[PDB]
Write a protein that binds this ligand. Structure first.
Ligand SMILES: *[C@@H]1O[C@H](CO)[C@@H](O[C@@H]2O[C@H](CO)[C@@H](O)[C@H](O)[C@H]2NC(C)=O)[C@H](O)[C@H]1NC(C)=O
Ligand SMILES: *[C@@H]1O[C@H](CO)[C@@H](O[C@@H]2O[C@H](CO)[C@@H](O)[C@H](O)[C@H]2NC(C)=O)[C@H](O)[C@H]1NC(C)=O
Ligand SMILES: *[C@H]1O[C@H](CO)[C@@H](O)[C@H](O)[C@@H]1O
Ligand SMILES: *[C@H]1O[C@H](CO)[C@@H](O)[C@H](O)[C@@H]1O
Ligand SMILES: *[C@H]1O[C@H](CO)[C@@H](O)[C@H](O)[C@@H]1O
Ligand SMILES: [Ca+2]
Ligand SMILES: [Ca+2]
Ligand SMILES: [Ca+2]
Ligand SMILES: [Ca+2]
Length: 443
């Protein structure tokens, strides 16, 4: 090691507010070492020095690695004072060599540092759809006899806004998205025109303020149903206004802008019958007629969701309802009670769906009934510790049900694998005992 560090200037210019908070940046010093790079001999660190001028060095400091000069303390000093802070830049070679340099740090009278009209700007909210160059709000700061250069210091990472550094007006730069970020807090600074030209920023309570930008959510996403295609079934004996299925649409918008009204569009049915109705807000479809002798019939309609309660955007799904009776059904006897099965149906059904689907693409299991396990003497009597669960499946290909006996194969075939998947719903030693044909059928 045999070069010292050498400051870029011997004397450095700096300014500081008379009240400045501890850690307020005044300026940066810089030194180079001609010893070989990536080496303790070319490794430059910065201290201060108390020898020549001690008071300056009590109240000020230099960030050891960066060379940023900062206030060491909340200070209270008289305007037009001039501190002489001597910083030393030193090696880390053997032996250590160093170099000093001075920073003439001038204290301002408060009237030379601009004061913003307010400490925090909370402009009205901004449409996420607002066009580029849309005015968000306006900063303003003054200070006698000198004109102002406005700027964003921090918080505009994503380059979402810009500022007319002349008028103090803030505008949309890139487009916006409430689905990404709802809020912004910009830090704005106002330095004076002379002082930008010298390249000394003088941060203070006075000449920094914050801007609080709130993005207004807009109805920019349309409803999307859980499923493009819904598949249900009715029994021939379904009572008027029987539950058939519950549709649901969703929307990345918040509030009223994601709140659905539901309506159907059935192709005309004879004798001016509606066939089916939906509840406008629950999205629950029901039976609006009887289906006597209509087995292997089917109905294809479509359902609409419109958000903002039918004032907004819309999306659609297609629905299929197939007619059936006991001929299409199988019974699933489980060693657990009906209240348990019924409680967990959406999930159990969803399992059976997965198993039937590997045979029949897009098949849908449908749940005619759940009750006590019928047993004994021509199924006369019932056991409420076990459960008869009555099901059927619907092929979207055919629109008609699946063969009772095919349904049996698909399930009895995979009953070991199903009973594993049921384990969590049914509990320890819970399982499907058998699958059987409805008691009515057998002739
Ligand atoms: C302050 O405002 C002006 C714009 O009103 C900026 O000046 C432009 O700067 C760009 C980018 O450096 C140059 O390419 C243009 O030639 C300038 N044009 C005009 C018409 O001014 C200026 O850079 C802004 N910022 C600062 C800190 O001064
Ligand atoms: C969201 O929609 C609802 C229902 O259509 C609106 O609520 C009604 O507002 C009127 C008058 O503005 C009142 O008379 C009712 O008391 C309100 N009813 C309900 C159920 O809230 C609601 O204003 C809408 N919300 C927004 C944020 O626009
Ligand atoms: C710079 O600091 C170093 C510390 O080792 C001294 O060697 C030098 O005389 C000067 O004070
Ligand atoms: C500049 O002056 C200081 C004393 O403040 C020394 O430590 C440094 O080495 C250089 O002489
Ligand atoms: C900066 O300049 C001062 C005098 O203005 C010196 O005392 C100091 O050591 C440094 O060179
Ligand atoms: Ca060196
Ligand atoms: Ca958006
Ligand atoms: Ca939105
Ligand atoms: Ca929406």
């Amino acid at each position: 090691n045999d070069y010292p560090p050498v400051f870029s200037k011997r004397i450095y210019k700096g300014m500081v507010a008379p009240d400045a908070v501890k850690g307020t940046p005044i300026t940066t010093v810089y030194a180079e070492d001609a010893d070989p790079p990536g080496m303790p001999a070319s490794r430059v660190r910065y201290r201060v020095d108390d020898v020549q001028f001690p008071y300056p060095a009590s109240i000020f400091d230099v960030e050891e690695d960066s060379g940023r000069v900062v206030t060491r303390v909340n200070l209270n000093e008289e305007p037009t004072t001039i501190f002489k802070l001597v910083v030393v830049a030193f090696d880390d070679g053997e032996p250590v060599m160093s170099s000093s340099a001075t920073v003439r740090i001038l204290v301002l009278h408060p009237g030379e540092i601009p004061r913003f009209t307010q400490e925090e700007y909370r402009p009205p909210p901004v449409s996420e759809l607002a066009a580029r160059g849309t005015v968000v709000g306006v900063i303003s700061a003054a200070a006698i006899n000198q004109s102002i250069v406005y700027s964003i210091v921090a918080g505009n990472e994503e380059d979402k806004f810009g500022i007319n550094n002349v008028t103090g007006v803030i505008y949309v730069n890139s487009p916006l998205d409430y689905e990404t970020r709802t809020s912004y807090v910009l830090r704005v600074q106002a330095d004076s025109l002379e002082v930008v030209l010298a390249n000394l920023r003088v941060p203070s309570k006075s000449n920094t303020a914050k801007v609080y930008i709130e993005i207004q959510d807009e109805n920019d996403h349309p409803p999307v149903f859980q499923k493009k295609f819904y598949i249900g079934g009715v029994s021939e004996d379904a009572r008027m206004f029987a539950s058939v299925l519950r549709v649901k649409a969703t929307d990345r918008d918040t509030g009223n802008y994601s709140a659905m009204a539901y309506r159907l569009i059935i192709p005309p049915i004879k004798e001016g019958k509606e066939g089916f109705v939906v509840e406008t807000y629950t999205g629950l479809i029901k039976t609006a007629m009887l289906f006597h002798n209509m087995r292997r019939s089917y109905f294809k309609f479509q359902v609409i969701a419109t958000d903002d309660y039918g004032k907004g955007l819309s999306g659609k799904a297609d629905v299929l309802v197939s007619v059936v009776n006991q001929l299409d059904m199988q019974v699933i006897v489980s060693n657990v009670p009906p209240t348990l099965v019924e409680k967990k149906i959406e999930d159990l059904t969803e399992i059976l769906d997965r198993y039937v689907q590997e045979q029949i693409p897009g098949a849908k299991v449908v749940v005619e009934s759940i009750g006590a396990r019928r047993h004994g003497d021509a199924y006369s009597l019932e056991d409420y510790s076990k459960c008869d669960l009555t099901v059927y499946a619907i092929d979207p290909q055919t629109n008609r049900a699946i063969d009772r006996n095919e349904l049996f194969k698909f399930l009895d075939g995979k009953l070991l694998d199903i009973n594993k998947d049921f384990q969590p719903y049914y509990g320890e030693g819970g399982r499907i005992l058998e699958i059987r044909t409805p008691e009515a059928v057998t002739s």
